Design a protein around this motif. Sequence first.
Motif, PDB file in Angstrom:
ATOM      1  N   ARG A   3       0.817  -1.206   0.000  1.00  0.00           N
ATOM      2  CA  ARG A   3       0.000   0.000   0.000  1.00  0.00           C
ATOM      3  C   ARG A   3       0.856   1.263   0.000  1.00  0.00           C
TER       4      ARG A   3
ATOM      5  N   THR B 255       2.580   0.877  -4.117  1.00  0.00           N
ATOM      6  CA  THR B 255       1.534   1.470  -4.931  1.00  0.00           C
ATOM      7  C   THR B 255       1.777   2.969  -5.056  1.00  0.00           C
TER       8      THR B 255
ATOM      9  N   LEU C  94      -2.436   6.839  -7.572  1.00  0.00           N
ATOM     10  CA  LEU C  94      -3.529   5.877  -7.501  1.00  0.00           C
ATOM     11  C   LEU C  94      -4.074   5.770  -6.085  1.00  0.00           C
ATOM     12  N   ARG C  95      -3.199   5.895  -5.082  1.00  0.00           N
ATOM     13  CA  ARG C  95      -3.670   5.940  -3.701  1.00  0.00           C
ATOM     14  C   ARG C  95      -4.560   7.154  -3.458  1.00  0.00           C
TER      15      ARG C  95
ATOM     16  N   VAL D 190      -6.465   8.797  -5.797  1.00  0.00           N
ATOM     17  CA  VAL D 190      -7.776   8.669  -6.435  1.00  0.00           C
ATOM     18  C   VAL D 190      -8.631   7.626  -5.711  1.00  0.00           C
ATOM     19  N   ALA D 191      -8.012   6.563  -5.181  1.00  0.00           N
ATOM     20  CA  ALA D 191      -8.759   5.618  -4.357  1.00  0.00           C
ATOM     21  C   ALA D 191      -9.209   6.247  -3.044  1.00  0.00           C
ATOM     22  N   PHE D 192      -8.396   7.146  -2.484  1.00  0.00           N
ATOM     23  CA  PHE D 192      -8.762   7.873  -1.274  1.00  0.00           C
ATOM     24  C   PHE D 192      -9.962   8.783  -1.514  1.00  0.00           C
TER      25      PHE D 192
ATOM     26  N   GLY E 122     -12.286   8.293  -3.863  1.00  0.00           N
ATOM     27  CA  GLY E 122     -13.435   7.413  -4.026  1.00  0.00           C
ATOM     28  C   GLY E 122     -13.954   6.873  -2.707  1.00  0.00           C
ATOM     29  N   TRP E 123     -13.042   6.495  -1.808  1.00  0.00           N
ATOM     30  CA  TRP E 123     -13.447   6.008  -0.495  1.00  0.00           C
ATOM     31  C   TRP E 123     -14.088   7.112   0.335  1.00  0.00           C
TER      32      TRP E 123
HETATM   33  C1  LIG Z   1     -11.183  13.494 -10.304  1.00  0.00           C
HETATM   34  C2  LIG Z   1     -10.343  12.243 -10.537  1.00  0.00           C
HETATM   35  C3  LIG Z   1     -11.166  11.108 -11.160  1.00  0.00           C
HETATM   36  C4  LIG Z   1     -11.190   9.838 -10.301  1.00  0.00           C
HETATM   37  C5  LIG Z   1     -11.457  10.105  -8.798  1.00  0.00           C
HETATM   38  C6  LIG Z   1     -12.713   9.397  -8.243  1.00  0.00           C
HETATM   39  C7  LIG Z   1     -13.348   8.313  -9.143  1.00  0.00           C
HETATM   40  C8  LIG Z   1     -13.017   6.846  -8.804  1.00  0.00           C
HETATM   41  C9  LIG Z   1     -12.301   6.603  -7.465  1.00  0.00           C
HETATM   42  C10 LIG Z   1     -11.578   5.236  -7.388  1.00  0.00           C
HETATM   43  C11 LIG Z   1     -12.399   4.032  -7.887  1.00  0.00           C
HETATM   44  C12 LIG Z   1     -13.577   3.647  -6.962  1.00  0.00           C
HETATM   45  C13 LIG Z   1     -13.207   3.595  -5.468  1.00  0.00           C
HETATM   46  C14 LIG Z   1     -14.293   2.974  -4.552  1.00  0.00           C
HETATM   47  C15 LIG Z   1     -13.729   2.122  -3.392  1.00  0.00           C
HETATM   48  C16 LIG Z   1     -12.248   2.407  -3.004  1.00  0.00           C
HETATM   49  C17 LIG Z   1     -11.273   1.250  -3.332  1.00  0.00           C
HETATM   50  C18 LIG Z   1     -10.442   0.686  -2.186  1.00  0.00           C
HETATM   51  O1  LIG Z   1     -10.014  -0.450  -2.134  1.00  0.00           O
HETATM   52  O2  LIG Z   1     -10.170   1.553  -1.149  1.00  0.00           O
HETATM   53  C19 LIG Z   1      -9.009   2.360  -1.254  1.00  0.00           C
HETATM   54  C20 LIG Z   1      -8.271   2.653   0.100  1.00  0.00           C
HETATM   55  C21 LIG Z   1      -8.751   4.050   0.671  1.00  0.00           C
HETATM   56  O3  LIG Z   1      -7.662   4.962   0.829  1.00  0.00           O
HETATM   57  C22 LIG Z   1      -7.042   5.004   2.114  1.00  0.00           C
HETATM   58  O4  LIG Z   1      -7.870   4.252   2.993  1.00  0.00           O
HETATM   59  C23 LIG Z   1      -7.323   4.164   4.297  1.00  0.00           C
HETATM   60  C24 LIG Z   1      -7.954   2.923   5.043  1.00  0.00           C
HETATM   61  O5  LIG Z   1      -9.373   3.087   5.167  1.00  0.00           O
HETATM   62  C25 LIG Z   1     -10.228   2.103   4.561  1.00  0.00           C
HETATM   63  O6  LIG Z   1      -9.380   1.246   3.815  1.00  0.00           O
HETATM   64  C26 LIG Z   1     -10.013   0.196   3.106  1.00  0.00           C
HETATM   65  C27 LIG Z   1     -10.873   0.817   1.971  1.00  0.00           C
HETATM   66  O7  LIG Z   1     -10.833  -0.161   0.962  1.00  0.00           O
HETATM   67  C28 LIG Z   1     -10.916  -0.705   4.005  1.00  0.00           C
HETATM   68  O8  LIG Z   1     -12.230  -0.641   3.538  1.00  0.00           O
HETATM   69  C29 LIG Z   1     -10.870  -0.219   5.482  1.00  0.00           C
HETATM   70  O9  LIG Z   1     -11.945  -0.858   6.099  1.00  0.00           O
HETATM   71  C30 LIG Z   1     -11.067   1.334   5.644  1.00  0.00           C
HETATM   72  O10 LIG Z   1     -10.598   1.726   6.894  1.00  0.00           O
HETATM   73  C31 LIG Z   1      -7.573   5.556   4.976  1.00  0.00           C
HETATM   74  O11 LIG Z   1      -8.658   5.445   5.835  1.00  0.00           O
HETATM   75  C32 LIG Z   1      -7.848   6.662   3.913  1.00  0.00           C
HETATM   76  O12 LIG Z   1      -9.183   6.653   3.527  1.00  0.00           O
HETATM   77  C33 LIG Z   1      -6.891   6.461   2.692  1.00  0.00           C
HETATM   78  O13 LIG Z   1      -5.565   6.636   3.058  1.00  0.00           O
HETATM   79  O14 LIG Z   1      -6.876   2.695  -0.181  1.00  0.00           O
HETATM   80  C34 LIG Z   1      -6.129   1.554  -0.023  1.00  0.00           C
HETATM   81  O15 LIG Z   1      -5.845   1.196   1.105  1.00  0.00           O
HETATM   82  C35 LIG Z   1      -5.692   0.795  -1.273  1.00  0.00           C
HETATM   83  C36 LIG Z   1      -4.722   1.601  -2.161  1.00  0.00           C
HETATM   84  C37 LIG Z   1      -4.677   1.198  -3.654  1.00  0.00           C
HETATM   85  C38 LIG Z   1      -6.022   0.787  -4.305  1.00  0.00           C
HETATM   86  C39 LIG Z   1      -6.368   1.423  -5.669  1.00  0.00           C
HETATM   87  C40 LIG Z   1      -7.851   1.206  -6.092  1.00  0.00           C
HETATM   88  C41 LIG Z   1      -8.369   2.096  -7.255  1.00  0.00           C
HETATM   89  C42 LIG Z   1      -7.261   2.832  -8.039  1.00  0.00           C
HETATM   90  C43 LIG Z   1      -7.716   3.532  -9.343  1.00  0.00           C
HETATM   91  C44 LIG Z   1      -6.548   3.933 -10.274  1.00  0.00           C
HETATM   92  C45 LIG Z   1      -6.925   4.293 -11.726  1.00  0.00           C
HETATM   93  C46 LIG Z   1      -6.375   5.668 -12.174  1.00  0.00           C
HETATM   94  C47 LIG Z   1      -7.325   6.457 -13.100  1.00  0.00           C
HETATM   95  C48 LIG Z   1      -8.235   7.453 -12.359  1.00  0.00           C
HETATM   96  C49 LIG Z   1      -9.708   7.015 -12.353  1.00  0.00           C
HETATM   97  C50 LIG Z   1     -10.098   6.264 -11.073  1.00  0.00           C
HETATM   98  C51 LIG Z   1     -10.884   4.984 -11.352  1.00  0.00           C
END
Ligand SMILES: CCCCCCCCCCCCCCCCCC(=O)OC[C@H](CO[C@@H]1O[C@H](CO[C@H]2O[C@H](CO)[C@H](O)[C@H](O)[C@H]2O)[C@H](O)[C@H](O)[C@H]1O)OC(=O)CCCCCCCCCCCCCCCCC
Lengths: 48, 127
Positions: B24, B28, B32-33, B35-37, B39-40
Motif C-alpha cells: 500500500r 503502490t 492511484l492511492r 484517487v482511491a482515497f 473514491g473512499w
Molecule cells: C477526479 C479524478 C477522477 C477519479 C477520482 C474518483 C473516481 C473513482 C475513485 C476510485 C475508484 C472507486 C473507489 C471505490 C472504493 C475504493 C477502493 C479501495 O479499495 O479503497 C481504497 C483505500 C482508501 O484509501 C485510504 O484508505 C485508508 C484505510 O481506510 C479504509 O481502507 C479500506 C478501503 O478499501 C478498508 O475498507 C478499510 O476498512 C477502511 O478503513 C484511509 O482510511 C484513507 O481513507 C486512505 O488513506 O486505499 C487503499 O488502502 C488501497 C490503495 C490502492 C487501491 C487502488 C484502487 C483504485 C485505483 C484507481 C486507479 C486508476 C487511475 C485512473 C483514475 C480514475 C479512477 C478509477
Amino acid sequence: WIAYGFLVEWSSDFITIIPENVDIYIWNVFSKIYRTIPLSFISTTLGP
Amino acid sequence: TDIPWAEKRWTLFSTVWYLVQQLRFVGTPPALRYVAFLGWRALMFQVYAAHKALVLWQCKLDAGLARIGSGGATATFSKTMALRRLHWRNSPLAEALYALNLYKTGRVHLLPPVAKPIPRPTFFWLF
Ligand SMILES: CCCCCCCCCCCCCCCCCC(=O)OC[C@H](CO[C@@H]1O[C@H](CO[C@H]2O[C@H](CO)[C@H](O)[C@H](O)[C@H]2O)[C@H](O)[C@H](O)[C@H]1O)OC(=O)CCCCCCCCCCCCCCCCC
C-alpha cells in the motif's frame, strides 16, 4: 603525459576515482526501473 | 511516543499484514492511492448519509414501540440514544434490550449501558 593519460587511473583503486554521484545515479535508475515488480507480479499471478 | 505494546506484538498475522501495508505505502503509487482515497471518501459520505437516515427511522420506530407498551402516553424518543446509535456506542444486545423495553413497558429515558471498546484480540504467536 602518461601520468594523466592512463597511469594514475590504471594503477589506482577504482573506488577512489569514481564519484559517488554515478553510484547513486545507477542505483536510482535501477530502483526506478524495478519498482512495479510487486504489483505486476500480483497482477499476473492473481489474473486468469 | 504512546504506542500500546499490544500493537507492537510480532505475530504471523502481523508478518503477513506488513506485506499488505508495504504494498500500500511503498508498492503502490501515491497518485492511484489518492484517487482511491477520493473514491473512499465519497463512498463513506454516502454511507454516512444512509446511516443518518437509518438512525432517524430508528427514532421513529423508537416512538412507535414506546407507544405500543405504554398505551398512548409516552410517544417521544431518546435523543441521547439517537446520538448513541449514530456514534456506534451501542451493542446489538443493548439495541434489542432497549427495543423490547420500549415495546413492553415504555420508559424512553431508561437507556442500556454504553458498550465498551472492543480490545484487540491476541492468540499467542498467531495474531
Ligand atoms: C477526479 C479524478 C477522477 C477519479 C477520482 C474518483 C473516481 C473513482 C475513485 C476510485 C475508484 C472507486 C473507489 C471505490 C472504493 C475504493 C477502493 C479501495 O479499495 O479503497 C481504497 C483505500 C482508501 O484509501 C485510504 O484508505 C485508508 C484505510 O481506510 C479504509 O481502507 C479500506 C478501503 O478499501 C478498508 O475498507 C478499510 O476498512 C477502511 O478503513 C484511509 O482510511 C484513507 O481513507 C486512505 O488513506 O486505499 C487503499 O488502502 C488501497 C490503495 C490502492 C487501491 C487502488 C484502487 C483504485 C485505483 C484507481 C486507479 C486508476 C487511475 C485512473 C483514475 C480514475 C479512477 C478509477
